Every structure is written in structure tokens, then in C-alpha cells.
């Protein structure tokens, strides 16, 4: 809440462990393979724009 | 730029996602929209 300089006030961050947690939809292997094959085509390109 | 204009390669002034996606992919997305929602992974132009 104050614009105090935490660096001189004394404050440290000691990161112990960093992990990556991914969630996979357990879709059937057949439909997942079909979706992958269809999305590997050039016309099925995913487009994203920064808000 | 060699094969397509940039406004078409980046879907800025081209066709809808219902027109430039594969028909099979469009059908798959509309069939699985209730629980997987592929729809927000594709962009459409919306020019003025």
C-alpha cells in the first residue's frame, strides 16, 4: 500500500521448486487422433490475437 | 505473402472460421462444442 523500496527495506523471495501442471481431456484415442490429423493440415491453422 | 495476402494468412480481412476451416473440423467443433469448445482457437476478420 506504500511505494516503499522493498529492496532496501529488506525482502527476499526464495523459490524452492517450480512445476508445470497440465490437464488433458481424456478423449478417446480414435477421435483424438482424428482431431490431431485434421489440425495438422495447413487450412486448419489456429489464429490468436493479443487483446 | 508469396501465396496469400497477409490480411488473409492472418485472418484479418478474409473469411469466417466456418468458411476457411475444413468442413469436417467445423462439424467436429459444432458437435463437441458442449464439452470441449474448439471454437475460441480460430479467428475471423470482422471488417468494417
Amino acid at each position: 500500500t506504500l511505494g516503499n523500496d522493498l529492496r532496501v527495506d529488506g525482502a527476499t523471495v526464495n523459490i524452492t521448486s517450480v512445476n508445470l501442471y497440465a490437464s488433458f481431456f481424456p478423449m478417446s484415442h480414435n477421435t483424438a487422433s482424428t482431431l490431431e490429423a485434421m489440425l495438422r493440415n495447413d487450412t486448419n491453422d489456429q489464429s490468436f490475437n493479443d487483446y | 505473402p508469396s501465396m496469400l495476402p497477409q490480411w488473409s494468412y492472418m485472418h484479418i480481412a478474409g473469411q469466417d472460421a466456418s468458411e476457411y476451416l475444413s468442413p469436417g473440423l467445423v462439424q467436429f467443433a459444432q458437435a463437441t462444442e458442449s464439452y470441449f469448445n474448439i471454437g475460441n482457437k480460430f479467428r475471423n476478420p470482422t471488417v468494417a
Binding site: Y51 | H11, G39, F42, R43, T46
Partner: peptide, 8 residues
């Protein structure tokens, strides 16, 4: 189906 979410 696509999305057209953008600032402005």
C-alpha cells in the same frame, strides 16, 4: 466457429 474478441 471463431472468436472476434479485441480491444476497441
Amino acid at each position: 466457429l471463431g472468436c472476434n474478441k479485441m480491444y476497441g
